[PDB]
Amino acid sequence: VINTFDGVADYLQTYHKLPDNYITKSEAQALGWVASKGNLADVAPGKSIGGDIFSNREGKLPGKSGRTWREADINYTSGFRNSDRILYASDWLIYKTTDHYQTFTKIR
Numbered sequence: 001v002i003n004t005f006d007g008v009a010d011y012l013q014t015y016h017k018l019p020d021n022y023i024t025k026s027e028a029q030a031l032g033w034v035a036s037k038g039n040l041a042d043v044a045p046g047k048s049i050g051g052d053i054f055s056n057r058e059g060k061l062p063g064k065s066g067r068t069w070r071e072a073d074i075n076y077t078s079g080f081r082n083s084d085r086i087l088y089a090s091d092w093l094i095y096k097t098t099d100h101y102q103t104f105t106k107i108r
Contacts (some may be wrong), residue, residue: 001019001021001046001047001048001073002019002020002021003019003021003048003073003074003076003077003084004074004075005074005084005096005107007019008050008072008074008086009086009088009093009094009107009108012086012088012092012094013094013108014088016092018050018051018072020045021048022047022048022049022050022051022072022073023047023048023049023050023051023063024049024050024051024052025049025052026045026052028043028049030043031043031044035081038079038080038081039077040081041077041079041080048073048076049072049073049076049081050070050071050072050073050086051070051071051072052070052071053068053069053071054070054071054072054087054101055069056069056070060101060103060104061087061089061095062089062093062097062103064091066090067091068089068090069087069088069089069090070087070088070089070090071085071086071087072085072086072088073085074096083097083098083099083100084097084098085097085101086102087104092108093106093108094106094107094108095107
C-alpha cells in the first residue's frame, strides 16, 4: 500500500492521480462505512479515504482562480482515521498536515 507522504507525493506527481487504495467518503459510505464505528478496514479492506475537494475556507493554502485543492489520508491502516493528510492542487503543489488541517508545510 502506497499510503506514505513520500509514496503519495511521488505518485501524485508521476501519475497525476491517486494510487488505487483510495476512495472518497461518499464511496466509502456506500459500502457500509460508519465514521462512529471506525470500521473502514472491514467494509473496504486495504483502502483509505482520499480525493475529496478541500474547500480551503480559511485561505491557509495558496489561492488562485482555477486552482482546486484536494485531500487524502496518510498512514492509515485500520480503526479510526488519523490526523495526517496530504493536500494536492490541480497545478500539483503538494502540502502536508499532521494536525488535522491546522498547519500546512510544503512537500512538493
